[PDB]
């Protein structure tokens, strides 16, 4: 029993700050109604969209 | 040509409400599952005190 | 360990620096998008010059906002979109050379060629742009900073202060041919903004993978 | 630009509740482990009295 | 057996007043919700934050 | 006895060295997985070269991160995934020849 | 271990009587529906508002 | 001119319900976090009694 480090809790923390991030990303789409808010969601999707909107 | 392009752009850009709400709920549960197990993960080191005395 | 957990802060402080830049270019897209409707409307020949020059008022006001976003967007005390944020090195890693570079190009109206920025000389007699296009004051007709072709550039009766910049949109009011010409210039600017946005969305996607790997 | 900077400042300034509560519990146990052994550390010198008589 | 000094207990006292200090520092963050309360927690973090808040 | 209890530390110091490597390749999988979506999208012919080259920006950024993981993943002061961690001998045992070898191949782009 | 003073609890008390005050101030706005209840929330906002209401 | 001034005065004076309810909930949690840790802060001095005996 090692006390100075709780690897079980430290590992669970990373999974905690990995579903919260995904939920935050999902709620951005739900609020805005758009798949592509940032350019990192779809580079070609962002490029095609702007050409499309312009047209 | 505006309808055909508006529909074309909506598929590329707009989100599917059904397929996204269902995915949001999943990660909204996976974080509570990790939340629930994090509480127990902290309790486990607390049991060495009864051995140390 | 204390390096990877700190290099995970640097990776996330670079994610914030990059979200700010693409968040700003999110609006240069909307301004460029609106700026393209005021060239399909100005190209129609039912408009008169009294109304093409009427559209030019918003042309110069949109092009002056594209320039504002470039010179005002600032993370920490760094101007990101004014062409000075080059070779930005994020130490994503606990050792030497575990870095990532980044260079955001200048994304103002002058660079996208959807406008031009005149600056006022010391006396304020002549508005001067980079490359040096002159615009002298009270030159008689309606009063303002006239150009070498009697085309009014700025509407002012007094003299502008020192180092006051004015931004003038691309020409859509001189003719219907000119407004059509501006259409390709604007639609190309949308292309070189989309290129910059996903040059920054690509880095942000990478930095999201770098964070999971540093955390693991 | 306020959201992008508010989020940027929160990462720099705000604490992670999960990663900090888990660390607080650790030092809250390490002090009880030292507390438990301090009591025994004082008992050890008490055994020379039975030898001195 | 040396009686005038209990080095075993004297050493344990220092470790006692080293996890209590860490727990106190951890509880400051938990109560306030801020990583940087004093300027000694992050000098550059304090400097960047204030610029950020001001902005 | 003092050999088996110490050779049990070596066995566990090799478990840590191996968890680090596969922990790193856990992400080369995700990058390669994302890198495969930016080839089913680039293969469609509704894209133009202005947009295929637009996808190539993330192509080169993902492929440059796969290389980073190989050259940066380091247990102790050993680069594991750069092809230099070969013939790693763990003394799992208290005597001669009670070892296990291991060779991790180069896993960069 | 100093007993006569609990600085950890004394520090937490101040943070306790600093989020309660903020919540009370936030609930004043929510109940009334006005940003500026007192003149200390916005001096110029109070001044401009009254001119505006009068007009 | 009344609509243009009524809207002008509402922006200056009226509160944003969304941006204020979200802020109220934050401080309503930060006080419970301090409430939770205050309880533990009082328990910490209680451990010297087992050492004093």
Numbering used by the authors:
A (entry chain A), E (entry chain W), G (entry chain B): 1 to 55
B (entry chain A), D (entry chain W), H (entry chain B): 275 to 327
C (entry chain L): 56 to 194, 198 to 274
F (entry chain Q): 56 to 164
From the primary publication:
The first fibril species was identified to be flagellar fibrils due to the similarities of its 2D classes and 3D map to that of Bacillus subtilis flagella. Upon structural comparison, we observed differences between Bacillus amyloiquefaciens and Bacillus subtilis flagella, namely: (1) the former contains an additional D2 domain, whereas the later contains only D0 and D1 domains; (2) the later has three additional loops (L1, L2, and L3) compared to the former. These differences arise from the sequence variations between the two proteins (sequence identity 57%). Notably, these variable regions face outward from the flagellar fibrils and do not affect the assembly of flagella. In summary, our findings suggest that while the structures of flagella in Bacillus amyloiquefaciens and Bacillus subtilis are largely conservative, there are notable differences in their domain compositions that likely reflect sequence variations between the two proteins.
In this study, we extracted extracellular fibrils from lab-cultured Bacillus amyloiquefaciens, a Gram-positive bacterium with great potential in biotechnological applications such as plant growth promotion, biocontrol, and commercial enzyme production. In this study, we use cryo-EM to identify protein fibrils surrounding lab-cultured Bacillus amyloiquefaciens and discover an unreported fibril species in addition to the flagellar fibrils. In summary, our study identified two protein fibrils outside Bacillus bacteria: the extensively studied flagella and the previously undiscovered Vpr fibrils.
